Amino acid sequence: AVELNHTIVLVKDKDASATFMADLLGLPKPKEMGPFAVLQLANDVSILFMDFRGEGDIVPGHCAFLISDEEFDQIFGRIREGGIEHWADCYHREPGRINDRDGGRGVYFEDPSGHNMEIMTRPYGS
Amino acid sequence: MAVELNHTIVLVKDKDASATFMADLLGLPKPKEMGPFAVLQLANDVSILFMDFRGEGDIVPGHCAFLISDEEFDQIFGRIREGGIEHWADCYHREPGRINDRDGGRGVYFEDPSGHNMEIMTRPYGS
Numbered sequence: 001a002v003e004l005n006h007t008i009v010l011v012k013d014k015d016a017s018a019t020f021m022a023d024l025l026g027l028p029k030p031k032e033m034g035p036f037a038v039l040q041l042a043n044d045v046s047i048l049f050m051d052f053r054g055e056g057d058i059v060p061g062h063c064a065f066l067i068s069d070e071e072f073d074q075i076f077g078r079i080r081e082g083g084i085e086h087w088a089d090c091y092h093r094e095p096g097r098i099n100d101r102d103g104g105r106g107v108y109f110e111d112p113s114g115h116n117m118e119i120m121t122r123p124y125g126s
Numbered sequence: 127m128a129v130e131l132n133h134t135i136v137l138v139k140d141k142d143a144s145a146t147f148m149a150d151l152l153g154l155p156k157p158k159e160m161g162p163f164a165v166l167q168l169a170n171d172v173s174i175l176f177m178d179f180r181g182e183g184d185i186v187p188g189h190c191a192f193l194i195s196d197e198e199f200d201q202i203f204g205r206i207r208e209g210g211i212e213h214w215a216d217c218y219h220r221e222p223g224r225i226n227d228r229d230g231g232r233g234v235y236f237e238d239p240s241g242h243n244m245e246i247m248t249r250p251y252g253s
């Protein structure tokens with residue numbers, strides 16, 4: 001069975017983005033590994049945050065996280081208490097709302113570099 | 127309690143070309159069409175969503191690394207060899223036509239049609 005083991009996400013500040021995501025998602029502090037700040041997820045995959053060295057701006061990507069119901073209450077609680085801008089939809093046309101797709105709950109937010117981050121409590125499509 | 131990475135987007139020139147190349151090479155079923163995405167489902171409850179790049183410049187190459195079994199490596203590397211797919215032992219592509227022996231396992235790097243840095247490995251990094 002072929003697993004996705006790690007992927008790189010380019011950001012303006014790897015420590016700022018990795019720590020923001022770890023704190024918000026309720027995960028341990030990211031590990032420093034060479035030029036990477038490592039965010040380890042539960043399903044044997046890690047995001048390697050790396051400082052962008054190019055000249056222009058960050059090309060925003062998309063990472064979506066599947067979490068438990070209790071974790072949604074905790075993470076969305078930190079979104080609300082921290083005044084973090086959030087949206088119910090990927091295109092950010094529904095600000096300040098959460099979605100109820102697939103019988104679960106979901107919400108979108110951004111890391112400091114503007115990547116489109118998402119949490120969800122049920123797999124897409126049921 | 128578990129935060130999982132469920133999916134991530136990879137921008138490419140041709141989502142069907144890249145997703146099919148990866149599925150064929152990795153021995154996976156044909157990618158699934160979902161809206162503007164060609165979906166490559168991996169075993170550990172995570173999918174790569176290939177999406178056509180709409181910008182003006184060239185693709186910013188990313189990095190995706192896949193952990194596979196020893197038997198799967200023989201099959202996948204067999205397709206790399208038989209297909210004449212350019213490959214390297216190292217992330218910087220200075221060792222062409224070689225595989226690495228990192229962590230007592232085997233690993234090799236290659237590219238999708240849009241030039242993303244793809245990697246397969248039989249043992250987790252660091253052991």
Ligand SMILES: [Fe+3]
Pocket residue numbers: 062064090118133
């Ligand atoms: Fe999504």
Ligand SMILES: [Fe+3]
Pocket residue numbers: 006189191217245
């Ligand atoms: Fe790697």
